[PDB]
Design a protein around this ligand. Structure first.
Ligand SMILES: *[C@@H]1O[C@H](CO)[C@@H](O[C@@H]2O[C@H](CO)[C@@H](O[C@@H]3O[C@H](CO[C@H]4O[C@H](CO)[C@@H](O)[C@H](O)[C@@H]4O)[C@@H](O)[C@H](O[C@H]4O[C@H](CO)[C@@H](O)[C@H](O)[C@@H]4O)[C@@H]3O)[C@H](O)[C@H]2NC(C)=O)[C@H](O)[C@H]1NC(C)=O
Ligand SMILES: *[C@@H]1O[C@H](CO)[C@@H](O)[C@H](O)[C@H]1NC(C)=O
Ligand SMILES: *[C@@H]1O[C@H](CO)[C@@H](O)[C@H](O)[C@H]1NC(C)=O
Ligand SMILES: *[C@@H]1O[C@H](CO)[C@@H](O)[C@H](O)[C@H]1NC(C)=O
Ligand SMILES: *[C@@H]1O[C@H](CO)[C@@H](O)[C@H](O)[C@H]1NC(C)=O
Ligand SMILES: *[C@@H]1O[C@H](CO)[C@@H](O)[C@H](O)[C@H]1NC(C)=O
Ligand SMILES: *[C@@H]1O[C@H](CO)[C@@H](O)[C@H](O)[C@H]1NC(C)=O
Ligand SMILES: *[C@@H]1O[C@H](CO)[C@@H](O)[C@H](O)[C@H]1NC(C)=O
Ligand SMILES: *[C@@H]1O[C@H](CO)[C@@H](O)[C@H](O)[C@H]1NC(C)=O
Ligand SMILES: *[C@@H]1O[C@H](CO)[C@@H](O)[C@H](O)[C@H]1NC(C)=O
Ligand SMILES: [Cl-]
Ligand SMILES: [N+]
Ligand SMILES: [N+]
Ligand SMILES: [N+]
Ligand SMILES: [N+]
Ligand code: NA
Ligand code: NA
Ligand code: NA
Ligand code: NA
Lengths: 204, 333, 216
C-alpha cells in the first residue's frame, strides 16, 4: 500500500501522524511496530481497538481508504519502523527518527591484540560513543601519514533511551606493515567538538 | 431471535435396516405430513450463515450418526486408544428435516440470489427445514440443494483468502464413482462437456466480483489426502479421488476419469485423531452422486499475470451443513 | 505466554532449498492458523502464505507458487516452510506469526525470533574473538568478533549480566568475504582491576561458543 511519510523526524514531546492509504463495508486494518533488530509487534487491530499492553498515547483512526496512526508525545521506545497491514498486503513502512541536543562523542582507541598479531594481521579500532547527530568524520593516520582504502566503519541504530549513535572504525593491515610503522592515531571531526580530537598510541 | 434445542424429522422406516434409518427412528420424529409455509409480506430480516447455531447442532447429530453407523475397528487419539468390533453396515444418506419446538420458529429466505449473509426481503417462516442429506465430503459438495435462479457465491469475506468460499450451482453435474471387481483401486467418471460447461459458468460468476481478471482453476495447494482429493463415504467405504483433472483450465470435452483409492485409515473430521476401518467389502461398489456445490479457496497476494486462482479445499464439515442451512435461522416468537 | 521458537540460521547455495521450522507452545496448536512472512535486509515485510494446522490446508503467495511448500507436524506442534530453487533475492529473515483469534488471524500478535537465511556460495566459518583492552574517569573496552560467516553472531557480557552501556555494532563484510563486528562496553576505570569482564560470543551456524577475557 501507500504509507506516508516514508521518513519522519521529530523530538520528544510531540505528536506524529502517519497515514496509510488503500485501494477499494469492512473497516479492517492492523498496525505494527518494529524496534531495530526485533521482530514486528502488533499495537492496533480492527482500525481502533488498541491491543492490551499498548499505552494510551497511540490512537488509530480513519475509514474507507485513508487510515491514520497518531502518536501523542513521542517517547524513546517509540523510535522504530511502523507498518500498516490490510489482510495480506502491507505498507512501505515509515521510519520514525527522533531529534535531540548535540552530544560530544566519547572517543576511544584500542590497539591490536597479541593473539591477533600472532596470526598475521593487525586491526586497530576507534570508537565514537554516544553522540548526536549521526555524521562524523573519522580519520586514520599512522605517525602523520593518513591511510585510505583499508578502514571499514559501522554505526548502530539510534539508541532508544538517549537518542544517540555510536560509530566503530576498524583499520586492517598486515603484521609486517603493522610493526613497520610505530604510531597510530584516530582524529575525529564532529559538530559537538570545537577542535578535532585526536586520540592515539605509539607501540607498533 | 434466540437459541433453542431443535429436533429432527425424517421418513425413516422402522423396518428398514439401513443404519441412518435405524438411527433416525431412535432420535427423529416422523415427517410432519402438513408443512406450514408462512410468507411474511414486505419484511426484511438479517441472516448470517456463518454464525448459525443450527450448523453446530447438525454437526453434533452427524457425529452421533457416525458413532453408531461407521464404528471404526481402531480409534486413535493422542490421549486415548479404542479397539472395538467394526461390523459393516448399509450406508446411504437420507434427508433430515430440522424443526423448532413450541415457542420458536424457523425463518426461511425465499430470495433466490441471497448470498447467505445480510438482509433478506422475501422472508417466510416454517416449522421444519426441507430434506437435507448428511453427505460428508470435501472439495465437491454432493447431494445438496441447488440454486433456483443462478449460481450463488457465499463467503464470510471474499477479500479474505483464509475464508472458505462455498459455491452453489443451479444445475447438478453427475459423478459416478465405482470400485469394480488391487482391491483398493477405484475410479470416477464425469462428463467433461457438462463439467467444462459448469466451470465456465462459475468462472463467469467469479469474474463479476473480480472484474478485469482471468479466473483459473488449479489443484489443491496441499494438506492431508482428505482435502487434496475428493474424499467421501460410499456404502460404508471411504473413497479418495484425484481431482487434478477437474480443477483445470484445459478441461477436455470427453468423459474425465478420476483415479481413486479406497482407504481403511482415515483422519477423522469429528475430532482430531485417526480412525481405522476394516478392509473394503467385495463386489461392485458404485455411487452415482449429484455435484451440487463446490468448496474453493483463492490464492493470496496480488497477481503478476492478472489471474485469480481458485483451488478446492474443505475439511470442516460445518461448511457442508452451511451450504444447506444458509437460508434458515431459529427465532423466538 | 504463547511462544514461537524458530530454527537456527541457514546458509544455502543457489538452486538449493531450505526448510525453516517454527515450534509453537502455550496454546492449542491446531486451533489457530499460522503465517510465514519474510523480510529482505533493509526492506519491508513480504507475506508468503498461511497453513491451517488443523487439517493441513495451505495458501501460498502467487509470487512464490511452485517453489514454496508449507507443512506441519501436529505431534510436535511444529510448522515447516520450505523454499526451493533459492536465489540471492531469497536472502531474508523468515518469520512465523499467529493471529489473535481463529476468525481473524491476520492480526499477528505473536511472532518468532526470526530465522535468517543467507544465500551465497561461501561456506560456514566460525569467528575469532580478540580483546580490546582499555588504557580515572570512565574507560571503554570490548572485543572484535572477526572473520565469520554467515551473519548471525550473538554477544553478551558476563553471561548477560552487563547490559547497560553495551553497544554491539552491525557486521561489516570484509574484502575476504567474511564478516567482522565489535562489541564494546563503557565501564569506569575504578573497576578495571576488581571487576572481571568476559566476552560471550555465539555463532550458531558453526556451533562455536567462546569466552574471552578482556583486561589491561
Ligand atoms: C447421492 O444421491 C444419489 C441418489 O439419491 C445416491 O445414489 C444412491 O447411492 C446408494 C449407495 O451408492 C445406492 O444404494 C445402492 O444402490 C445399488 C442399486 O440399487 C438397486 O439396484 C437393483 C437393480 O434395480 C435393485 O434390484 C436393488 O433394489 C438395488 O437396491 C445397489 O447395488 C446397492 O446394493 C447394496 O446391497 C448390499 C445390501 O443391500 C450392500 O451391502 C451393498 O453395499 C450394496 O450397496 C445399494 O442399494 C442407491 O441405489 C443409489 N440411488 C440412485 C437413484 O442412484 C448417491 O449414492 C448419493 N451419494 C452419496 C455419497 O451418498
Ligand atoms: C419470493 O420470490 C418472488 C418475489 O420475491 C415472489 O413471486 C414469491 O411469491 C416469493 N415467495 C412466495 C412464497 O411468495
Ligand atoms: C436478494 O438479496 C440481495 C441482497 O444483496 C438483493 O441484492 C437482491 O435484490 C434480493 N433479491 C430480490 C428479488 O430482491
Ligand atoms: C444457472 O446460472 C448461470 C449463470 O449464473 C446460467 O448461465 C444458467 O443458464 C443457469 N441455469 C439454469 C437452469 O437456470
Ligand atoms: C449433462 O446433464 C444433462 C442433464 O442431466 C444430461 O442430459 C446430459 O446428457 C449431460 N451431458 C453429457 C455429455 O452426458
Ligand atoms: C482475461 O480477462 C479479459 C477481460 O478482463 C478477457 O478479455 C480475456 O479474454 C481473459 N483472458 C483469459 C485467458 O481468460
Ligand atoms: C493427481 O494426479 C496428478 C497427475 O497424475 C498428480 O500430479 C497429482 O500428484 C495427483 N494427486 C494425488 C493426491 O495423488
Ligand atoms: C490441466 O491438466 C493438464 C495435464 O493433464 C496440464 O497440461 C495443464 O497445465 C493443466 N492446467 C492448469 C491451469 O493447471
Ligand atoms: C470442445 O470442442 C473441442 C473438442 O471437441 C475442444 O477443442 C474445445 O476446446 C472444447 N470447447 C469447450 C468449451 O470445452
Ligand atoms: C495432543 O497433545 C497436546 C499436548 O499434550 C495437547 O495440547 C492436545 O490437546 C492433544 N490433543 C489434540 C492435538 O487433539
Ligand atoms: Cl472423507
Ligand atoms: N424446496
Ligand atoms: N504434503
Ligand atoms: N421475531
Ligand atoms: N481478546
Ligand atoms: Na468411546
Ligand atoms: Na493404506
Ligand atoms: Na484391519
Ligand atoms: Na548475497
Amino acid at each position: 500500500m501507500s504509507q506516508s511519510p516514508s521518513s519522519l523526524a521529530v523530538s520528544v514531546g510531540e505528536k506524529v501522524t502517519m497515514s496509510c492509504k488503500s485501494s477499494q463495508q469492512k473497516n479492517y486494518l492492523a498496525w505494527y511496530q518494529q524496534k531495530p533488530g526485533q521482530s514486528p509487534k502488533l499495537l492496533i487491530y480492527w482500525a481502533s481497538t488498541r491491543e492490551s499492553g499498548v499505552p494510551d498515547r497511540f490512537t488509530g483512526s480513519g475509514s474507507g481508504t485513508d487510515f491514520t496512526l497518531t502518536i501523542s508525545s513521542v517517547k524513546a521506545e517509540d523510535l522504530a519502523v511502523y507498518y500498516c497491514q490490510q489482510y495480506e498486503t502491507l505498507g512501505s513502512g515509515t521510519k520514525l527518527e527522533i531529534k535531540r541536543t548535540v552530544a560530544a562523542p566519547s572517543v576511544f582507541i584500542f590497539p591490536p591484540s597479541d593473539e591477533q598479531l600472532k596470526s598475521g594481521t593487525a586491526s586497530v579500532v576507534c570508537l565514537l560513543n554516544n553522540f548526536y547527530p549521526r555524521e562524523a568524520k573519522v580519520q586514520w593516520k599512522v605517525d602523520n601519514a593518513l591511510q585510505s582504502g583499508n578502514s571499514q566503519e559501522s554505526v548502530t541504530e539510534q539508541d532508544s533511551k538517549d537518542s544517540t549513535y555510536s560509530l566503530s572504525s576498524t583499520l586492517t593491515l598486515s603484521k609486517a606493515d603493522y610493526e613497520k610503522h610505530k604510531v597510530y592515531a584516530c582524529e575525529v571531526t564532529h559538530q559537538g567538538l570545537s577542535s578535532p580530537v585526536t586520540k592515539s598510541f605509539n607501540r607498533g | 431471535e434466540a437459541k433453542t434445542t431443535l429436533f429432527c424429522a425424517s421418513d425413516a422406516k422402522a423396518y428398514e435396516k439401513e443404519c441412518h434409518n435405524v438411527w433416525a427412528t431412535h432420535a427423529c420424529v416422523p415427517t410432519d405430513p402438513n408443512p406450514q409455509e408462512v410468507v411474511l409480506e414486505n419484511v426484511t430480516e438479517n441472516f448470517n450463515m456463518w454464525k448459525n447455531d443450527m450448523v453446530d447442532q447438525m454437526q453434533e447429530d452427524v457425529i452421533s450418526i457416525w458413532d453408531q453407523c461407521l464404528k471404526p475397528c481402531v480409534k486413535l487419539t493422542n490421549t486415548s486408544t479404542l479397539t472395538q468390533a467394526c461390523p459393516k453396515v448399509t450406508f446411504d444418506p437420507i434427508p433430515i428435516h430440522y424443526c423448532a419446538p413450541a415457542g420458536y420458529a424457523i425463518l426461511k429466505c425465499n430470495n433466490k440470489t441471497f448470498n447467505g449473509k445480510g438482509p433478506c426481503n422475501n422472508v417466510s417462516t416454517v416449522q421444519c427445514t426441507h430434506g437435507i442429506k448428511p453427505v460428508v465430503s470435501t472439495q465437491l459438495l454432493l447431494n445438496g440443494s441447488l440454486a433456483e435462479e443462478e449460481i450463488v457465491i457465499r463467503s464470510k469475506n471474499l477479500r479474505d483468502n483464509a475464508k472458505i468460499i462455498i459455491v452453489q450451482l443451479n444445475k447438478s453435474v453427475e459423478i459416478v464413482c465405482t470400485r469394480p471387481n488391487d482391491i483398493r483401486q477405484a475410479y470416477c467418471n464425469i462428463s467433461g462437456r457438462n463439467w467444462s460447461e459448469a466451470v465456465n459458468q462459475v468462472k463467469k460468476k467469479l469474474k463479476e466480483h473480480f472484474p478485469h481478471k482471468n479466473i483459473s482453476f488449479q489443484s489443491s495447494s496441499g494438506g492431508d489426502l482428505e482435502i487434496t482429493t475428493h474424499s467421501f463415504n460410499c456404502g460404508g467405504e471411504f473413497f479418495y479421488c484425484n481431482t487434478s483433472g477437474l480443477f483445470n483450465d484445459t478441461i477436455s470435452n470427453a468423459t474425465i476419469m478420476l483415479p481413486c483409492r479406497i482407504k481403511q485409515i482415515i483422519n477423522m473430521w469429528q475430532e482430531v485423531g485417526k480412525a481405522i476401518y476394516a478392509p473394503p467389502i467385495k463386489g461392485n461398489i458404485t455411487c452415482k452422486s449429484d455435484i451440487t456445490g463446490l468448496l474453493l479457496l483463492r490464492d493470496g497476494c496480488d497477481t503478476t499475470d492478472n489471474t485469480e486462482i481458485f483451488r478446492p479445499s474443505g475439511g470442516d464439515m460445518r461448511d457442508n451443513w452451511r451450504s444447506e442451512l444458509y437460508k434458515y435461522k431459529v427465532v423466538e416468537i | 505466554q504463547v511462544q514461537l521458537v524458530q530454527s537456527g540460521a541457514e546458509v544455502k547455495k543457489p538452486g538449493a532449498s531450505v526448510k525453516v521450522s517454527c515450534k509453537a507452545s502455550g496454546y492449542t496448536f491446531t486451533g489457530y492458523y499460522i503465517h510465514w512472512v519474510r523480510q529482505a535486509p533493509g526492506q519491508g515485510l513480504e507475506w508468503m502464505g498461511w497453513i491451517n494446522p488443523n487439517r493441513g490446508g495451505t495458501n501460498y503467495c502467487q509470487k512464490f507458487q511452485g517453489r514454496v511448500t508449507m507443512t506441519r507436524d501436529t505431534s510436535i506442534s511444529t510448522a515447516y516452510m520450505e523454499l526451493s530453487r533459492l536465489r540471492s533475492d531469497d536472502t531474508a529473515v523468515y518469520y512465523c506469526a499467529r493471529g489473535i483469534n481463529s476468525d481473524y488471524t491476520w492480526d499477528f500478535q505473536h511472532w518468532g525470533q526470526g530465522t535468517l537465511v543467507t544465500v551465497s556460495s561461501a561456506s560456514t566459518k566460525g569467528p575469532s574473538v580478540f580483546p580490546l583492552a582499555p588504557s580515572g574517569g570512565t574507560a571503554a573496552l570490548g572485543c572484535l568478533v572477526k572473520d565469520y560467516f554467515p551473519e548471525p553472531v550473538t554477544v553478551s557480557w558476563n553471561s548477560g549480566a552487563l547490559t547497560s552501556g553495551v553497544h554491539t555494532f552491525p557486521a561489516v563484510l570484509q574484502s575476504s568475504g567474511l564478516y567482522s563486528l565489535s562489541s564494546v562496553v563503557t565501564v569506569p576505570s575504578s573497576s578495571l582491576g576488581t571487576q572481571t569482564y568476559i566476552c560471550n560470543v555465539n555463532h550458531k551456524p558453526s556451533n562455536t561458543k567462546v569466552d574471552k577475557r578482556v583486561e589491561p
